[PDB]
Write a protein that binds this ligand. Structure first.
Ligand SMILES: CCCCCCCCCCCCCC(=O)SCCNC(=O)CCNC(=O)[C@H](O)C(C)(C)COP(=O)(O)OP(=O)(O)OC[C@H]1O[C@@H](n2cnc3c(N)ncnc32)[C@H](O)[C@@H]1OP(=O)(O)O
Ligand SMILES: CCN(CC)Cc1cccc(-c2cc(Cl)c(S(=O)(=O)Nc3c(C)nn(C)c3C)c(Cl)c2)c1
Length: 411
């Protein structure tokens, strides 16, 4: 049983999600005036806080909570170490609503105890193509297309409760208060991901990893040495050779994205993202924010030929604290962000990603099997990992889709 999730406008079982045919809301329609204006009650030793995302010391405070208390692997060997710069970037996109950043502090000393963050996203989330087809056969086209237009909704990330405060039901309260603040801005849907199984995902995808620095990955035990590499003399030289990469990209006309590329990148990205059932819609400003390079945070390259941007790729950095080793403090991981190819095969574009990530000192490259990420797995030597990223809507009935019909990257 789910004492909290059973009370919420989400599908409640796998069975329920498989019978859904049309996209649409679940809840009673409400209005801003229906929503309580006062924050949800919490115990008297705690207070609600709205962090200022431009205050270095507020960012710092959130940074520390997440450094010590955020997502770990199942064997507690790694914990995410999102940087302060990464957090300002993720939390403060264009037109972000400060009130959507929800923190609980200890009233006495103002120690931060819990955090949840919401940012705006414009998302296509209408009935998926296959169901739309089936609806025409059945005569229900107008029903299937009712919510086809991109919607301005909330993207929830960064939910974290301090380890000292776990299992005290503080997360339900955080989610209720975030929901209140979002509803009071006339927004009624949300999208979120989790590694855990909650009621109920509309999509699920496995994680994939590409060793860039296998000696380190083996030392820290992210990776194992293959059983077949044992029947060799010095297996470490063999593993290194297996994963080796050119020192420089193979596409002539690859360079870093610059501000003037914004319109062309937006155009080729939107064309590509348009073919997926679930995907974001970006303005020029959002393309600038989410894709222009920032030191230590986001790395973006375009292929330009004849003065035309024909392809691009992006990746971003999230180091993980290595909990148990001594020789190493950090895993430096690059994550496949957005991309688009028109002039070359995807596998050839993404090799350049690997090449750049490797020469800049990253240890591994990570991705979930959304977009067309599967198309390059075998040739670029990515392996499936333990992780499964699940995708969820709050207050939105949506049929079950393959992860290759998802075009939304979560930070
Ligand atoms: C329209 C606007 C709507 C906006 C809201 C949209 C929904 C937002 C949803 C949030 C999207 C988050 C997206 C991400 O960031 S997912 C990443 C979540 N973060 C972490 O895992 C960091 C490390 N862990 C922790 O900090 C805590 O253990 C957390 C905070 C995760 C749980 O704290 P704690 O261990 O102290 O437990 P509790 O006693 O307070 O509460 C127990 C209840 O919480 C349910 N639970 C456990 N894990 C999750 C989870 N990842 N999403 C949603 N619910 C979760 C659980 O089923 C139970 O409910 P029920 O089973 O009794 O019913
Ligand atoms: C990214 C956070 N949010 C995005 C919104 C999603 C999310 C949520 C839940 C779990 C995952 C996830 C991610 C990765 Cl990248 C891996 S991993 O690489 O192999 N191993 C690993 C390492 C190196 N460090 N950590 C901390 C772990 C878990 C694994 Cl298991 C799980 C991701």
């Amino acid at each position: 049983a789910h004492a909290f999730w059973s009370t919420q406008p989400v599908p409640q079982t796998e069975d329920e999600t498989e019978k859904i045919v049309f996209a649409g809301p679940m809840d009673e329609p409400k209005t801003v005036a229906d929503i309580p204006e006062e924050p949800y009650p919490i115990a008297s030793t705690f207070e609600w806080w709205t962090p200022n995302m431009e205050a270095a010391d507020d960012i710092h405070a959130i940074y520390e909570l997440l450094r010590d208390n955020y997502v770990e692997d199942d064997d507690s060997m790694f914990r995410f170490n999102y940087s302060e710069e990464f957090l300002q970037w993720a939390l403060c996109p264009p037109n972000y609503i400060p009130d959507w950043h929800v923190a609980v502090r200890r009233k006495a000393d103002k120690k931060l105890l819990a955090f949840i963050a919401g940012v705006p996203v414009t998302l296509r989330m209408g009935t998926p193509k296959y169901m739309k087809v089936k609806a025409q056969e059945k005569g229900e086209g107008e029903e299937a297309a009712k919510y086809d237009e991109p919607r301005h909704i909330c993207e929830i990330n960064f939910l974290c409760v301090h380890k000292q405060l776990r299992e005290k039901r503080l997360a339900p309260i955080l989610i209720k208060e975030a929901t209140r603040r979002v509803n009071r801005t006339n927004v009624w849907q949300a999208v979120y991901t989790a590694g855990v199984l909650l009621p109920t995902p509309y999509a699920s995808g496995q994680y994939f990893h590409r060793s860039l620095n296998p000696e380190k990955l083996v030392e820290i035990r992210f990776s194992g040495i293959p059983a077949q590499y044992q029947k060799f003399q010095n297996p470490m030289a063999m593993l290194k050779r297996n994963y080796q990469l050119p020192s420089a990209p193979k596409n002539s006309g690859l360079r870093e994205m610059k501000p003037s590329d914004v319109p062309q990148v937006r155009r080729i990205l939107m064309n590509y993202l348009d073919s997926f059932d679930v995907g974001p819609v970006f303005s020029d400003a959002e393309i600038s924010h989410y894709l222009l390079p920032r030191d230590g945070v986001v790395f973006t390259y375009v292929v330009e030929n004849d003065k035309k941007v024909t392809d691009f790729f992006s990746f971003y950095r999230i180091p993980s604290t290595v909990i148990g080793n001594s020789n190493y403090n950090l895993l430096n991981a690059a994550y496949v962000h957005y991309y688009a190819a028109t002039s070359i095969p995807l596998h050839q574009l993404i090799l350049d990603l690997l090449i750049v990530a490797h020469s800049r000192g990253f240890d591994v490259c990570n991705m979930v099997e959304i977009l067309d990420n599967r198309s390059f797995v075998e040739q670029l030597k990515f392996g499936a990992g333990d992780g499964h990223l699940r995708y969820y809507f709050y207050n939105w009935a949506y049929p079950k889709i393959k992860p290759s019909q998802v075009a939304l990257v979560m930070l």
